[PDB]
Amino acid sequence: IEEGKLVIWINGDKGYNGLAEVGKKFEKDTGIKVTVEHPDKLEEKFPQVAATGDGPDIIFWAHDRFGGYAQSGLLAEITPDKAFQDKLYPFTWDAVRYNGKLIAYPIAVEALSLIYNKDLLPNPPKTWEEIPALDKELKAKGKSALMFNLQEPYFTWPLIAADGGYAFKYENGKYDIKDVGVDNAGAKAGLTFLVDLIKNKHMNADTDYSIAEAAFNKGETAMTINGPWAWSNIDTSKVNYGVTVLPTFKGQPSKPFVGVLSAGINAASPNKELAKEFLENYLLTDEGLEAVNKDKPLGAVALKSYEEELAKDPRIAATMENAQKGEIMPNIPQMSAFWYAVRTAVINAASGRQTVDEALKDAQTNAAAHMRGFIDYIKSSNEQRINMLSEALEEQYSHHGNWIFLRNNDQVVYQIMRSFEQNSDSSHNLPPKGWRTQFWVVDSQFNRLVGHSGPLPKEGPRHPIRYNNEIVGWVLTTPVERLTRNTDINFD
């Protein structure tokens, strides 16, 4: 990756020409090249080149497999000062946290809002409980009251969680994976409401994105649930429609998922300062966001200066209002596993095949069992590593019978371990990102031989280095709870 230059990657489905304008200004003032590119299958190209140390200095994403970039140590910590942070709504910094640290700039924000038909319904209901009533009142005139995609938990989990459902409890910048709120009191309440509107012939269990949309754009149902992306299809259909806050349930508000478009700095880039100056001084300004939004619109933005302008549009102010009330998508590993458990729990309840109380007990058990088997895997693997690093240091030791051969360099011991696996024809398993953090190797008298220069942990994992039926040294390894993939999780 080249020094003295900025290389930016963003999906072609977004305002890439408008970004290159912000680049051209950055060029004029600083004399630094700014090159903006839109590769195909971008979600997959980036981690492949960034995990070698090539690729772009700045990377944009809306989807990354629920935190994958961060879980891979592909992003550097961003360092905006207390000042700059207030230029952006406070919750949008929550959407870019990992291990309590910030890892990207919130550029744009999205959320489900409630889209109603002004003609068939001038005063949208503010609560869920007043919808059955309303369906009857419109079932007469030949219409339905509400139609949205029931298949995906993206559209149904706001209501389930409204009265207090949650995936895992976010306590202290970490997700207690041993604390699952899917069979919750409020979770039960949430889902059981929804199955009843299908029992009571109000909604149908088979309505998907297309059926529900193709209905609403024909004035066959008064209301729908969707986000900014669907507005352009409604527009060309000439339906006088509005966009408002989502209805409440047992008092609490619907908590849809905060979606965010993030701009991160590549952890390998020798341009992290350059890149900060770009994003903070040039992109995240009313002129910067403006130039992109013009090219292909953004939705709501996190910059308060500019959001307030865009919020002229009452649709966009509704989006941002719902996103404020929404909940932040957990970015722990193996979240896909969880949402697929939830996806079937809902499809089961709604098909009558299961009572709510069993579907959710099922989802809750399927989750605990997957997440326990996760902990099992991660743990038994890190142990096979410590063993081979031990076996490898032990072989090189018996060369001359002492620690001369070993320099105090962390990446020499890496290739010592890689050579050992190659020559013993072992399955290939080498230390994952973040391993170096609390890594030392020390001998009998706990003299430091590899590792940083400060004070060592009093306690913590230490596999011993055995030569001739005597301990000759110790590998103080890095606890699993704190490798980069797992540092967003709490295991108690």
Side-chain angles (χ1 to χ4, degrees), residues 1-81 83-135 137-140 142-168 170-237 239-311 313-492:
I1 300 193
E2 222 199 323
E3 205 288 323
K5 179 190 174 177
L6 277 188
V7 184
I8 295 172
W9 286 6
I10 186 163
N11 199 323
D13 68 351
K14 292 181 178 64
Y16 62 98
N17 285 319
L19 191 50
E21 307 273 21
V22 186
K24 280 304 147 283
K25 186 159 227 138
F26 192 82
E27 292 209 31
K28 180 210 273 231
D29 286 282
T30 82
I32 305 280
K33 207 170 182 167
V34 180
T35 319
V36 193
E37 323 200 280
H38 53 299
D40 311 41
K41 288 139 208 64
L42 160 68
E43 188 178 356
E44 281 67 44
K45 203 162 174 180
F46 173 67
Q48 293 181 325
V49 310
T52 315
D54 278 89
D57 314 271
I58 293 177
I59 177 56
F60 287 68
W61 75 94
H63 298 91
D64 73 325
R65 294 264 314 181
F66 297 117
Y69 290 164
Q71 308 167 13
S72 287
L74 293 199
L75 322 169
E77 186 164 3
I78 74 164
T79 62
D81 59 36
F84 187 100
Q85 308 205 5
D86 309 19
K87 287 192 71 74
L88 279 59
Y89 290 112
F91 75 87
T92 54
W93 295 109
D94 297 355
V96 295
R97 274 180 202 287
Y98 182 87
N99 184 28
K101 307 151 143 222
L102 294 179
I103 47 86
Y105 289 91
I107 299 317
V109 177
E110 267 172 6
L112 302 164
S113 34
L114 169 71
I115 318 163
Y116 58 98
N117 198 319
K118 289 236 203 75
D119 291 358
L120 319 163
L121 188 166
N123 300 77
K126 297 271 162 172
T127 65
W128 279 98
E129 292 93 333
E130 56 175 331
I131 302 187
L134 193 45
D135 192 44
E137 189 245 301
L138 298 108
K139 274 314 223 298
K143 314 298 193 193
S144 321
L146 168 63
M147 282 206 161
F148 65 105
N149 178 349
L150 314 181
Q151 315 301 329
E152 312 286 349
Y154 184 84
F155 296 82
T156 50
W157 186 263
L159 182 144
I160 304 173
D163 199 31
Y166 62 105
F168 312 79
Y170 178 86
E171 207 153 297
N172 261 38
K174 294 179 182 303
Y175 282 88
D176 314 331
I177 52 164
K178 278 184 180 173
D179 185 6
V180 157
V182 68
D183 218 354
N184 216 47
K188 288 205 183 80
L191 175 51
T192 178
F193 191 116
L194 165 65
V195 307
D196 282 344
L197 310 81
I198 317 173
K199 290 185 180 179
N200 298 351
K201 289 179 126 207
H202 296 307
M203 294 205 310
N204 179 0
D206 77 346
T207 50
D208 55 29
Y209 191 83
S210 285
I211 299 166
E213 158 178 74
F216 178 85
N217 299 24
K218 296 174 182 231
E220 295 169 9
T221 176
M223 306 193 281
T224 189
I225 296 172
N226 226 333
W229 53 93
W231 299 348
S232 156
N233 280 8
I234 315 182
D235 278 9
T236 73
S237 74
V239 177
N240 202 318
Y241 76 88
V243 182
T244 185
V245 52
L246 304 165
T248 79
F249 163 85
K250 292 213 187 295
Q252 337 295 134
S254 323
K255 288 192 287 174
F257 285 125
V258 184
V260 79
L261 167 67
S262 324
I265 301 166
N266 186 335
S269 157
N271 297 310
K272 328 222 187 94
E273 219 64 41
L274 253 174
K276 180 168 156 208
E277 332 189 1
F278 177 84
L279 300 151
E280 276 182 40
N281 284 7
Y282 285 81
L283 184 49
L284 273 179
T285 65
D286 303 64
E287 276 218 72
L289 302 190
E290 181 174 320
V292 177
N293 173 87
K294 190 159 301 173
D295 184 350
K296 294 197 261 284
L298 288 174
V301 306
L303 183 58
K304 286 141 109 165
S305 345
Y306 195 42
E307 163 65 15
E308 272 142 34
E309 288 175 33
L310 287 174
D313 198 331
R315 316 179 282 175
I316 294 196
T319 302
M320 174 62 54
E321 187 192 347
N322 275 313
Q324 214 136 21
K325 304 164 165 301
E327 89 192 70
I328 298 87
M329 168 67 53
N331 45 348
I332 58 196
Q334 304 259 359
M335 272 306 283
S336 294
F338 179 92
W339 293 115
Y340 284 132
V342 186
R343 185 201 153 87
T344 57
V346 178
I347 300 205
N348 269 4
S351 75
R353 174 156 323 170
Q354 282 196 283
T355 170
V356 167
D357 290 52
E358 62 194 335
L360 299 196
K361 208 178 292 261
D362 268 21
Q364 167 162 283
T365 43
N366 170 283
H370 171 85
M371 212 66 75
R372 151 182 310 111
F374 177 85
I375 302 180
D376 290 350
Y377 193 88
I378 183 190
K379 240 169 185 175
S380 192
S381 193
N382 183 75
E383 281 301 302
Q384 188 198 59
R385 264 179 246 127
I386 317 189
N387 182 240
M388 303 209 62
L389 173 63
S390 305
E391 317 187 276
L393 286 163
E394 281 168 359
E395 223 180 44
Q396 283 314 288
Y397 188 79
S398 69
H399 274 4
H400 302 121
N402 64 107
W403 289 107
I404 47 91
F405 74 89
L406 183 137
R407 312 178 30 202
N408 169 33
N409 168 244
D410 264 24
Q411 275 262 330
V412 173
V413 312
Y414 194 130
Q415 296 290 336
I416 289 178
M417 187 188 335
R418 176 165 168 117
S419 318
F420 176 80
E421 311 202 358
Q422 208 166 75
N423 301 339
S424 73
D425 221 37
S426 311
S427 65
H428 166 287
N429 177 223
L430 292 160
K433 277 236 170 190
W435 63 280
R436 302 184 323 262
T437 298
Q438 307 228 87
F439 180 92
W440 294 261
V441 310
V442 306
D443 68 340
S444 317
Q445 315 179 351
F446 267 56
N447 316 114
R448 184 224 315 179
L449 305 176
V450 181
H452 199 255
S453 48
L456 318 199
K458 213 147 68 166
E459 299 168 47
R462 36 206 76 200
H463 193 296
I465 308 279
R466 303 184 183 84
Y467 185 14
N468 268 343
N469 308 61
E470 276 157 26
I471 283 162
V472 312
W474 295 82
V475 186
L476 317 193
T477 87
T478 330
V480 188
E481 301 57 21
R482 293 182 183 174
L483 297 178
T484 316
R485 184 175 166 208
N486 314 136
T487 171
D488 220 25
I489 308 183
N490 167 21
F491 308 81
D492 295 338

